[PDB]
């Protein structure tokens, strides 16, 4: 009866009641291009999109029909993306869809995991992930940051952890600053912001600043946080700041005050360090050359044995250098039985 449901029927998707996954008569690309060219050929072309989103928003006021609109489409010719996700690929509908999608989300902050234990905020933010085009950067940026501001803790944690796949290249460093605005606000939200700043695109000066803000407070960190922190530290090293950050890291790391979750998180930390030394020689070679430069003091610790075994196992071209360093270290009265 509405223009929305009728144009969905013409474009080749059947809109059902709300209890099972919605069918799809044609291919996703064919449906998208047909809906696009049918909105193009209709008169009052800049104004029909308002009637479209009005019909959509009046349809999705029911929770079950909206939940079916968030779920995977049934493919006759067998699973595909959601109808919101398919409409999100079309550029003329996209900003109004983002507006209405960000509009009604604070209604669902407290009615979480209702019937079949799906998080409707998590579903509506997974409608945003792996977008091919973002038509407007700055409006989506301010909307997502105000959503992170107003949301309760665990839901906004999901919004943070999903930020690298959402945002386009024109809006990294802006969210580079504003995430650091949230970083000084709470100590409970250090680690997803640190993983996001490890995974976004940032300029190295800001990365140096936030690395210093991590590195001053390294002793106030329980072991659970220690992988995603140290990964961030081994992917913020410059070509000139190698030995300094490696020496500071090898000084500050205890691995004893933290010591069933502990052993598992230790294995995760050493996985992280293997991944960091695998493909960047500038950290492995500087770690080996930062061990023999602490041959003076006989008080070096358990870490410098395990790390020599790790770099000896992982990297093959540094085997002879590790062998020579171990021989010249053991002949110096250093590493022994104890």
């Amino acid at each position: 009866d509405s223009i929305f449901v009728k144009l969905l029927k013409i474009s080749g998707i059947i809109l059902k009641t709300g209890e099972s996954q919605n069918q799809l008569a044609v291919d996703q690309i064919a449906f998208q291009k047909k809906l696009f060219q049918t909105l193009r050929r209709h008169p009052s072309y800049p104004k029909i999109i308002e009637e479209f989103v009005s019909g959509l928003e009046s349809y999705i006021e029911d929770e079950d029909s909206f939940r079916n609109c968030l779920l995977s489409c049934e493919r006759l010719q067998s699973y595909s993306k959601s109808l919101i996700k398919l409409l999100l690929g079309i550029d003329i509908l996209q900003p109004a869809i983002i507006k209405t999608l960000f509009e009604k989300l604070p209604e669902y902050f407290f009615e979480n995991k209702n019937s079949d234990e799906i998080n409707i905020p998590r579903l509506i933010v997974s409608q945003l992930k792996w977008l091919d085009r973002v038509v407007d950067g700055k409006d989506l940026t301010t909307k997502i940051m105000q959503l992170i501001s107003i949301a309760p803790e665990n839901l906004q944690h999901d919004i943070i952890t999903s930020l690298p796949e959402i945002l386009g290249d024109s809006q990294h460093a802006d969210v580079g600053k504003e995430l650091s605005d949230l970083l000084i606000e709470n100590t409970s939200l250090t680690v997803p912001i640190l993983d996001v700043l490890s995974s976004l695109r940032l300029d190295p000066n800001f990365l140096l600043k936030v690395r210093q803000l991590v590195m001053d407070k390294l002793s106030s960190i329980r072991l659970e946080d220690l992988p995603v922190i140290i990964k961030f530290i081994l992917h913020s090293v410059t070509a000139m700041d190698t030995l300094e950050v490696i020496s500071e890291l090898r000084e500050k790391l205890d691995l004893q005050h933290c010591v069933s979750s502990g052993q598992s998180c230790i294995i995760l930390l050493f996985d992280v360090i293997k991944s960091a030394i695998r493909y960047e020689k500038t950290i492995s070679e500087a770690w080996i050359k930062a061990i023999e430069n602490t041959a003076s003091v006989s008080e070096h610790k358990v870490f410098d044995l395990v790390m020599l075994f790790i770099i000896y196992s992982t990297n093959t071209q540094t085997k002879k250098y590790i062998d020579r360093v171990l021989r010249n270290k053991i002949r110096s009265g250093c590493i022994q039985e104890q």
Partner: protein
Amino acid sequence: LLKAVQPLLKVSMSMRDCLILVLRKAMFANQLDARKSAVAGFLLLLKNFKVLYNSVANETFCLEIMDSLRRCLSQQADVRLMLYEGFYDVLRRNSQLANSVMQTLLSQLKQFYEPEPDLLPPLKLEACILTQGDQISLQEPL
């Protein structure tokens, strides 16, 4: 390595849908090599994965990848330039993508072409320069 592998991907299907997943998740990386590795993989899959298995299972499948390639044209200059140099070989080895590929270029032209006569610079060169924080970069090598 992806030139070598692909006789697996003509045979296999699970490995093909593993690769596309890797490449699509690789486009959203931060390290520089990952973007250009993803475009190299996408262009190879466009290139040798049909002439035009079932043909109906290819003409949509490249039209999936092609939509993913409209991410890369939004990204930085080197990732664009690999597409601009690759599309000619894609058209040569895969003819029926032509009606899509030219459209992918033509809309890409329309952000920089001012199609009104008697305005004397016919190209928008002030949008092909990215300036922020006194860092000046070329993007979209027109």
